[PDB]
């Protein structure tokens, strides 16, 4: 039942938005760096998060804007982060993590939005509008759509059913990436 959960109390997280926003950003960097070192439509749908130009809003500040204009609860940014986890990570026969795919900063910016709106759409019986958010991200609502389906397509073969363990694994998988 989902490798990235193999080793977490099936019981098993009281975190604040700052704590939440922290881990996400964290995981990104780690993934960006650790990357260096199963079908076509999958990769096909992944070409999207890759913007050629340089993200006008610094990655960190960029999320600051969104939490302001959207003011989410910690949950959002946690789930958001697991998608990244589940998208890129997986354990091996010895419960040792491994890299599924290579994550680049050229793809990071759009991947951020994808995970968050997608995340909220998993959580809330009511989210912001498609243009309220398409706005918050300086994104064409046509791309926004393409970036929901892109992510969704890429991770759908993983267990995305939201639950406290998956919520927990966000922060934990972070630790297991560092050292000490």
């Amino acid at each position: 039942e989902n490798p990235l959960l193999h080793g977490i109390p099936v019981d098993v997280p009281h975190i604040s938005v700052d704590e939440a926003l922290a881990n996400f950003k964290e995981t990104i960097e780690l993934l960006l760096k650790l990357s260096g070192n199963n079908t076509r439509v999958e990769k096909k749908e992944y070409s999207n998060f890759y913007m050629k130009s340089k993200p006008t809003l610094s990655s960190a500040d960029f999320l600051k804007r969104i939490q302001d204009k959207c003011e989410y609860q910690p949950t959002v940014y946690l789930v958001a982060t697991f998608l990244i986890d589940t998208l890129f990570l997986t354990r091996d026969g010895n419960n040792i993590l491994q890299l599924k795919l290579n994550l680049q900063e050229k793809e990071v910016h759009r991947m951020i939005i994808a995970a968050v709106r997608l995340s909220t759409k998993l959580l809330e019986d009511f989210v912001h509008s498609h243009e309220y958010f398409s706005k918050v991200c300086g994104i064409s609502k046509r791309l926004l759509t393409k970036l929901e389906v892109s992510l969704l397509i890429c991770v759908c073969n993983t267990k995305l059913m939201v639950s406290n363990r998956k919520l927990a694994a966000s922060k934990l998988l972070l630790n297991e990436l560092r050292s000490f």
């Binding site: 809330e124 019986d125 059913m161």
Partner: protein, 297 residues
């Protein structure tokens, strides 16, 4: 994926967000159900499809429809499901009669509760149980489908919607504004569906929130604070309105079916349709009601 992978066939139905066609896998020769979701670049990807997709790679049970694949073509998302021959409405319509024999009912309800018990075991609420969303096939299997309104419970969620569950199948406490329903909501639906199967007729054919409550109380009596003290908490609850005692359920039903409604059946039905959310049987304990005795060891 791969669009060319499936040959589209006859329309099998539609709902609010999707259109379903029979489909044929060109390779394996096996038939499927092609749930097509419109993807207008202006409105966005429907939360329903997202919930449906996530909640299906994890909810695997013989009484829950299987999702096989998810294809993304031009402005369209196709969720490929296992193919079922009917839904409960059509099936009953195709017999139009129109209520079912009591061994069929017991057998379909049993399977409803089995699939349901699994959802709840996994902290998942269906929130849209109604005959159109219960698929039946030739072997006679019944499977919950249409998990678009589904939601995981136990977790901190901010936004609210007491506007879930198609009206005829929505619980009184919800109608009155309860934003803290758990599994009791699905159970009420099962109670309605059970009635409908027995008589062939919907139990509470309301045309609006208020007419729905009126219909419920006409039969279940008005809310009785002695039996449901927390009722006073609900925003659309009104104490002043005129009392109204429950009717004898066996009597409101028996007319519409030639089959004799015994004690277990009626009891079992009262357990599902309890006005007080907390008093309604759980799926698990419904499964063990004596009415299902012949199904056991």
């Amino acid at each position: 994926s791969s669009s060319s992978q499936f040959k589209q066939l006859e329309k099998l139905g539609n709902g609010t967000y999707a259109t379903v066609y029979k489909g044929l896998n060109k390779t394996t020769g096996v038939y499927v159900a092609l749930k097509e979701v419109k993807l207008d670049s202006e409105e966005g990807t429907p939360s329903t499809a997202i919930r449906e997709i996530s909640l299906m790679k994890e909810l695997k049970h013989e009484n829950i429809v299987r999702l096989y694949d998810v294809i993304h073509t031009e402005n369209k998302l196709t969720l490929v499901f296992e193919f079922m021959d009917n839904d409960l409405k059509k099936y009953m319509d195709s017999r139009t009669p129109r209520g079912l024999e009591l061994n069929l009912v017991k057998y379909f309800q049993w399977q409803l509760l089995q699939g349901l018990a699994f959802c709840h075991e996994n902290k998942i609420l269906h929130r849209d149980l109604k005959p159109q969303n219960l698929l039946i096939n030739k072997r006679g299997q019944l499977k919950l489908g249409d998990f678009g309104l589904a939601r995981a419970f136990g977790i901190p969620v901010n936004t609210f919607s007491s506007e879930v569950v198609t009206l005829w199948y929505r619980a009184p406490d919800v109608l009155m504004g309860s934003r803290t329903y758990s599994t009791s909501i699905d159970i009420w639906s099962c109670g309605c569906i059970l009635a409908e199967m027995i008589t062939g007729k919907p139990l509470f054919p309301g045309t609006n929130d208020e007419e729905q409550l009126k219909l419920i109380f006409d039969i279940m009596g008005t809310p009785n604070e002695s039996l449901w003290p927390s009722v006073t908490k609900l925003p659309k609850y009104n104490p002043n309105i005129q009392q109204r005692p429950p009717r004898d359920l066996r009597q409101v039903l028996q007319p519409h079916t030639k089959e004799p409604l015994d004690g277990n059946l009626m009891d079992f039905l009262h357990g599902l349709l309890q006005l007080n959310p907390d008093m309604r049987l759980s799926a698990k304990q419904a499964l063990h009601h004596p009415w299902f005795a012949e199904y056991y060891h």
